[PDB]
Write a protein that binds this ligand. Structure first.
Ligand code: MG
Lengths: 470, 563, 79, 78
């Protein structure tokens, strides 16, 4: 019926039950205690079962601080894993790991629908047999690093390159075109940046189509390693019930794995290489296999990854890099010169850039642009600098078209219209292929470079140069 | 002792059973306790130590309910009478967690046996202690709780084996995962079986044609060899494997593809790629994706090679591909650490070299007395930042018969495949080649070796006009010839003829930017007016007369218009 | 005539693929029929188990006790 | 040449789509007929299974009473 506390060693607790009444693994248990005198404090705690040790004892991990616990307290078995609310009631609100609102707009009614946090991955016979391309509406992404429905993308960048603007633009474009929602999960990051993102999303207006879950540095190891699953189960409902295409953003996947190690040794497990838990790839696989493209809808996830000390051979980045399909690199150099977004065109990679996926025309145009940019990068540095400038023919034209193509990858976003009068554009992929091909052929070689700046389709560029006096 | 009955038993019956079992076993005196649990229906099940005797309803009844799934015929012939007593050797779980379990009992269980849990999940006994058994669970473990019951099956680990597996997708236990219905086989083969002996073999002479010019010319592979493909991620090794698998359409081979620790979406797309090219008439796919329990990932390669050996020991030729041998090692390390076995370098167990050598030594070429079959193995190993000094990469390099190296620098620039001939070796050598390829490949090897030294100094011309820019031009022409595109493998006669044209100085006039189109149009030309050189190479295995070859290449060049 | 020959080959390959698809659809129908037969048999078996349990419960146990004791004794003798 | 290849590709795609549509219609009709036959066989084989269940109980251990009791139990279960 009810268990009692045996040991309290940090974030790990031991509970003893009656014979033949042990809870299953992954269940949730509750401690609710009121002080009986001045030598006691009130307790409201949730625990998750981890191991069966034998002799009617189980070892559990706490979801909050364990200060104030007493050997002999009474524990209640809930009967099921952690359950979070799902549906339209979670749109525009902020939750914690247990599925409780941390804003001040009220509580979800107890007569709602709640889904468990742990479930198996979709089976082989109900996956997508074809690779499909996701239409974002950006120009550099849709040309040099296309995204995939149900894929995983690694976003590389930090401060001063503006990745929150890219996040908001993706949310807005996907919601407007494909009618999808977004879920943001912050896993063990700074609280200041979470507040900043919440207020930016409130200002833009993309909050009403997003659900936010936060578990950050201040929280125990147990809460940091079970918060991505709450966002995942909030997102899966829309794919499996409304048949939508959803986006899932993860603030730091690395922290997830890190949190696991912080409890592994306390559970009584021998260490593996570099002091990591023996069950590392299994945990990462059980997480990342639940986001796929089934026959109804799809979940595509953008994940930000921090590499410790820029060491890419560390077990955690090495394990998580085998699940990624594309990478998107944001560079400060392009942000200084006024290219928005600051996506690096020569360092962004994708596995969808192949003639059998996008097409022959797309592939040829993209490869021509890439080699032109590489030629510019090689030539402009060792030559034309240090007083070795020269004006060879076919080198005037190469830099002419390269400069006219580098500035056409910039775009005007809808979320940036609050600081700038331009409404913003959504450019399909055929249009940008046509525009880049036309620029490559030299048809638009008789215009100044200022016309190719913060513009959508190629034709609009002409109108710009019409009003510039040229 | 303990008796479970629907209703409590009479004293006379209890005494009779006690006397009967005391006489049968040979014990001094038995104290029999009975229960009144109505879970059974007018029957009793008895437990002597860890032995269960079952003669109750929902016992033998289920024994005929589970069987026969004519119905009235069995109901009146064999289902009416109990199918004897259901005897089992049981145990009791005492610890559960992380995918393993420990139990009390199972006195006569073997090492490596298969046990069945109460709810229907399987497990494999791997640690026989003095008073408990360590069991690794081959499935979901959240339904297993302390106090459960385990039973022995009596069979060492084994997999289904037959010709019905061709064109199907299965998991390491031999169960379909493509949803096309059951697989109808009639044989089994133990997963752990010995390798053919020293005197049961024969030297490797026949070639394995892949269709990739760089491999077929510089790193040849023979039937019965074990070649390693090593490189970082984002280098395209699965494409090499898939092209090799596709090329075997009319070469009388059976292919097996094992995917360990990959994504299910990528496995699905790979199977769909295989189906489109009609490569599912001779291929078997075994899959253990990243969300599966660690024992399945550790057991998949052995299942693949066990299915291959059945064809091997009947005179056929097989080719087995292992998607990653590092994921299997990591899974085995996890299992070993969870079972409290002493660790080693990078926490790997002591027998981690044994685990891979015992598997890779089952690929052989059999002698004429044993049939003449063969089995070729192509394991994959993935490195981080191009570091081949690591424990597993050095372990697998020292077992195989040579390695193929793929670089990440060449992949990004656009060189497909990104093979490096400066670090790739094949110890079988030219014995796995045809006479024409032997006569043609040496000059190509020497030319590439010469060009690789001076490739980095092309920025500074004005070098020795005699033999520096000539070697640069020859090397660039060589590098352009070795490029290729996804799918579309090339026949060996065409490869021989184009490499002959390159090495004899027939390509200097053609500029570097037109070499690919030149070779494509040459292939088109040979299909019409070169219909006898190809047949001569196919039938004789030696390249045709030099004067005829020169005249044919001279005739083609007059038509090819150079831009 | 090379283009026309390739066109004819592609058309014949497409027709062969269509025939294979129709055969696979027939095989899917056969698999569904086998699954339906199995499901019907399993439902019949479950209903039979329930009916037999009810009938056995309704049946008297005076002779059933002696018969069960004799059968258990015979089982002990056998093993 | 290129035009001939494009026409061949269009014809092949159209033929494959037509065969797929025919297969889909056949599969839908087969599924409907299979559902009807499954319902009819469920009823008939349920009566037969009640009779055979009385028979199996007798074998493990008049006919009209047993059949009526089995039918009543089946109705209660359903
Ligand atoms: Mg690869």
């Amino acid at each position: 019926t009810r268990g009692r506390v045996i040991q309290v060693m940090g974030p790990v607790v031991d509970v003893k039950f009656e014979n033949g009444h042990l809870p299953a693994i992954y269940n949730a248990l509750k401690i609710q205690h009121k002080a009986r005198n001045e030598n006691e404090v009130d307790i409201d705690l949730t625990l998750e079962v981890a191991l069966h040790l034998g002799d009617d004892t189980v070892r559990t991990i706490a979801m909050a601080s364990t200060d104030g616990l007493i050997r002999g307290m009474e524990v209640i078995d809930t009967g099921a894993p952690i359950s979070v609310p799902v549906g339209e009631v979670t749109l525009g609100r902020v939750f914690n790991v247990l599925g409780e609102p941390i804003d001040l707009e009220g509580d979800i009614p107890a007569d709602a629908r709640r889904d468990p946090i742990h479930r198996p991955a979709p089976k082989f016979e109900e996956l997508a047999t074809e690779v499909e391309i996701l239409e974002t509406g950006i120009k550099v992404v849709d040309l040099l690093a296309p995204y995939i429905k149900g894929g995983k993308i690694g976003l590389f960048g930090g401060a001063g390159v503006g990745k929150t603007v890219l996040i908001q633009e993706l949310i807005h474009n996907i919601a407007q075109e494909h009618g999808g929602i977004s879920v943001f999960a912050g896993v063990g990051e700074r609280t200041r940046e979470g507040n900043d993102l919440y207020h930016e999303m409130k200002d833009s207006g993309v909050i009403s189509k997003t659900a936010m879950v936060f578990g950050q540095m201040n929280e125990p190891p147990g809460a940091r390693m079970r918060v991505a699953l709450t966002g995942l189960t909030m997102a899966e409902y829309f794919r499996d019930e409304q048949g939508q295409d959803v986006l899932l953003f993860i603030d730091n996947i690395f922290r997830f794995t890190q949190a696991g190690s912080e409890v592994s040794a306390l559970l009584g497990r021998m260490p593996s290489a570099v002091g990591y838990q023996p069950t590392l790839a299994t945990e990462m696989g059980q997480l990342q296999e639940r986001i796929t493209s089934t026959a109804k809808g799809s979940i595509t996830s953008i994940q930000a990854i921090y590499v410790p000390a820029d060491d890419y051979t560390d077990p955690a980045p090495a394990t998580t890099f085998s699940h990624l399909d594309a990478t998107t690199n944001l560079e400060r150099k392009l942000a200084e010169m006024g290219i928005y977004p600051a996506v690096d065109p020569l360092a962004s990679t994708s596995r969808a850039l192949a003639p059998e996926i996008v097409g022959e025309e797309h592939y040829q145009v993209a490869r021509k642009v890439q080699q032109t940019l590489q030629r510019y990068k090689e030539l402009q540095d060792i030559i034309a600098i240090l007083g070795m400038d020269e004006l060879s023919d076919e080198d005037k034209l190469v830099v002419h078209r390269a400069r006219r193509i580098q500035f056409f990858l910039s775009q005007n976003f809808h979320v940036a219209e609050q600081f700038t009068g331009q409404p913003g554009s959504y450019v399909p992929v055929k249009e940008t292929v046509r525009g880049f091909k036309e620029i490559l052929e030299g048809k638009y070689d008789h215009l100044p470079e200022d016309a190719f700046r913060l513009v959508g389709r190629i034709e609009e560029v002409v109108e710009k140069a019409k009003a510039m006096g040229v | 002792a303990v008796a479970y009955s629907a209703r409590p038993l009479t004293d006379e019956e209890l005494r009779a059973l006690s006397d009967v079992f005391a006489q049968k076993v040979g014990k001094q005196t038995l104290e029999i306790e009975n229960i009144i649990d109505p879970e059974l229906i007018g029957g009793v099940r008895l437990r002597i130590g860890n032995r269960i005797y079952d003669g109750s309803v929902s016992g033998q009844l289920e024994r005929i309910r589970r069987q026969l799934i004519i119905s009235a015929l069995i109901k009146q012939q064999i289902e009416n009478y109990e199918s004897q007593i259901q005897v089992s050797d049981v145990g009791t779980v005492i610890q559960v967690g992380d995918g393993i379990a420990r139990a009390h009992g199972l006195d006569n269980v073997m090492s490596g046996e298969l046990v069945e849990f109460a709810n229907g999940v399987m497990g494999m006994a791997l640690n026989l202690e003095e008073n408990n058994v360590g069991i690794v669970i081959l499935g979901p473990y959240t339904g297993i709780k302390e106090g459960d019951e385990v039973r022995r099956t009596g069979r060492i680990m084994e997999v289904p084996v037959g010709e019905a597996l061709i064109g199907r997708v299965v998991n390491p236990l031999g169960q379909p995962v493509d949803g096309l219905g059951p697989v109808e086989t009639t044989e089994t083969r133990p997963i752990e079986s010995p390798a053919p002996g020293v005197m049961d073999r024969r030297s490797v002479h026949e070639p394995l044609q892949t269709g990739i010019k760089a491999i077929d010319a510089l790193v040849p592979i023979g039937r019965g060899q074990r070649e390693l493909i090593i490189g970082d991620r984002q280098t395209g090794k699965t494409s090499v494997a898939i092209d090799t698998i596709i090329n075997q359409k009319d070469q009388n081979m059976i292919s097996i593809y094992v995917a360990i620790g990959q994504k299910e979406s990528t496995v699905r797309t790979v199977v769909e790629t295989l189906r489109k090219h009609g490569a599912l008439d001779y291929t078997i796919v075994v899959t253990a994706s990243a969300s599966q329990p660690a024992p399945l990932l550790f057991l998949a390669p052995y299942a693949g090679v066990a299915m291959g050996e059945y064809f091997m020991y009947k005179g056929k030729h097989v080719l087995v591909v292992y998607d990653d041998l590092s994921k299997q090692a990591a899974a085995y390390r996890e299992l070993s650490l969870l079972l409290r076995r002493p660790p080693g370098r990078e926490a790997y167990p002591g027998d981690i070299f044994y685990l891979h050598s015992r598997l890779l030594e089952r690929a052989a070429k059999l002698s004429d007395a044993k049939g003449g079959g063969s089995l070729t193995a192509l394991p994959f190993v993935e490195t981080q930042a191009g570091d081949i000094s690591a424990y597993i990469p050095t372990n697998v390099i020292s077992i195989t018969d040579g390695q193929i190296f793929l670089q990440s620098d060449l992949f990004f620039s656009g060189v497909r495949p990104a093979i490096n001939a400066g670090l790739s070796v094949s110890r079988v050598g030219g014995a796995a080649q045809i006479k024409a390829m032997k006569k043609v490949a040496g000059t190509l090897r020497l030319d590439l070796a010469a060009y690789r030294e001076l490739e980095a100094f092309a920025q500074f011309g004005s070098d020795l006009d005699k033999a520096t820019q000539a070697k640069l031009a020859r090397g660039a022409r060589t590098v352009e010839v070795l490029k290729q595109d996804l799918h579309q493998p090339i026949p060996v006669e065409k490869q021989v003829l184009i490499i002959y044209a390159l090495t004899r100085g027939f390509l200097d006039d053609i500029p570097v930017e037109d070499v690919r189109r030149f070779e494509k149009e040459f292939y088109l030309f040979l299909d019409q007016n070169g219909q006898h050189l190809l047949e001569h190479i196919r039938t004789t295995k030696d390249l045709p007369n030099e004067d005829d070859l020169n005249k044919a290449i001279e005739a083609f060049k007059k038509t090819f218009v150079v831009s | 005539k090379l283009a026309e020959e390739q066109k004819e080959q592609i058309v014949a390959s497409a027709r062969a693929e269509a025939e294979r698809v129709k055969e696979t659809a027939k095989k899917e129908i056969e698999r569904e029929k086998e699954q339906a037969m199995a499901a019907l048999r399993e439902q019949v078996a479950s209903l039979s188990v329930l009916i037999a349990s009810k009938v056995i419960e309704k049946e008297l146990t005076e002779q059933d006790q002696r018969k069960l004791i004799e059968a258990y004794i015979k089982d002990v003798q056998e093993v």
